[PDB]
Design a protein around this nucleic acid. Structure first.
Ligand SMILES: [Zn+2]
Ligand SMILES: [Zn+2]
Ligand SMILES: [Zn+2]
Ligand SMILES: [Zn+2]
Lengths: 70, 73
DNA sequence: CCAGAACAGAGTGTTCTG
DNA sequence: TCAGAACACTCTGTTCTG
């Protein structure tokens, strides 16, 4: 019921991992697209519903560490 | 001789709200002080603010603006 | 249910003006 | 000189569709 990436309400099992929709479309867009994500902290940024927009790098990192794939 | 924004290190357009800055940090500061935003740092309140990452943490950006001495009067 | 498409908004940055 | 208006773009999130 809870997104393993940001803790928001999970819509379902997407790309191998229980997530919400925002993290679903984010993951696809992040992996295929050419983005210049760069962390401003220490690679341990808190990714929750409020702050997930802040550091796309760490968000993508959590997605990958969760095992998400296309 | 070229001037540098004291907030993000981008090219400063001039002295805005009391501090040498670019346009983006200017309008950002205005919108931030007046506007109702939910800025919250995801790190340790010491995020690196440069041209690439200034979009990342508005909280730390506003913090640098205030510590630089920016004001509306 | 799940993937992808598509529509809409927030936040941002530049150009123009006096 | 700098302040503010306004348009346009990027990124994101929800809704729609196959
Ligand atoms: Zn999520
Ligand atoms: Zn980060
Ligand atoms: Zn700046
Ligand atoms: Zn921060």
């Amino acid at each position: 019921k809870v997104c393993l990436i940001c803790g928001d309400e999970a819509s379902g099992c997407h790309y191998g991992v229980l997530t919400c929709g925002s993290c679903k479309v984010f993951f696809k867009r992040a992996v295929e697209g050419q983005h210049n994500y760069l962390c401003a902290g220490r690679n341990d940024c808190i990714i929750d519903k409020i702050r997930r927009k802040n550091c796309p790098a760490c968000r993508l990192r959590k997605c990958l560490q969760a095992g998400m794939t296309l």
